[PDB]
């Protein structure tokens, strides 16, 4: 059967696009991770690198 997406209907029947996010933790290839905290550069003094 088919959805009805006519503009005459209010909240509850109008289309709400949804995307499902689910991860896997059975195999361990150590891939897919996000970057963070890429700061500036410091020279000619003490450095906590």
């Amino acid at each position, epitope marked *: 059967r088919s959805y009805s997406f006519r503009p*005459t209907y209010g909240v*509850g*029947h109008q289309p709400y696009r949804v995307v499902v996010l689910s991860f896997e933790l059975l195999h361990a290839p150590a891939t897919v991770c996000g970057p963070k905290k890429s700061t500036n550069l410091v020279k000619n003094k003490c450095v906590n690198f």
Partner: antibody
Amino acid sequence: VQLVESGGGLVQPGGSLRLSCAASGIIVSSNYMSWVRQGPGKGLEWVSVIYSGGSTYYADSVKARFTISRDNSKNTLYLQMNSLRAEDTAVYYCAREVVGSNSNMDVWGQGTTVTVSS
Amino acid sequence: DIQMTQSPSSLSASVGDRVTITCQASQDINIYLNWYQQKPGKAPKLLIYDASNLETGVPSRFSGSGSGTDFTFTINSLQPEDIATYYCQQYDNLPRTFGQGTKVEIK
């Protein structure tokens, strides 16, 4: 395609049995069924719905009472209650889905208007 | 719980007259709002599907329009064989509930 009724008589409060309604060849396991109350002094009242996936949805005021059973070959749906509080002066009509999108398969059935009293 | 209320309940004096009966609801609902035509002593019956269709065998004078939680129906023909009662129900929403009841009768 018609419906077969099993019921009648008078029962006391606190007693429950298997209310039974059958089809005339319609699929009973792989179909949608609904139960409603027809009672004197009031309109029709929604009771329960059972889907082909084995999921039952019914009212929260009658929770922990309804136990439904769909027989595979006898084609006769059973329903069992528990702890009747004497408000069942009515009849349980069994029915199908009225319309999914566009369908005229709308055969219904009748029953005996049973009462529960001292 | 969904509560449906209707003003045209008992049209006992509406004999041979234009009928403008209707059903509403508290929460706004779509076209999925059907009706029950219950004869005395027999199960409720469907004439209109999705508040906009017609049963296969019925007189063609029946026409019901439902949009924006307002289902309006008319019966211009006052046939004696349809002494019954009319009910309003909404579906495709949890939970399915029935109306309080309306009376139709020809003197």
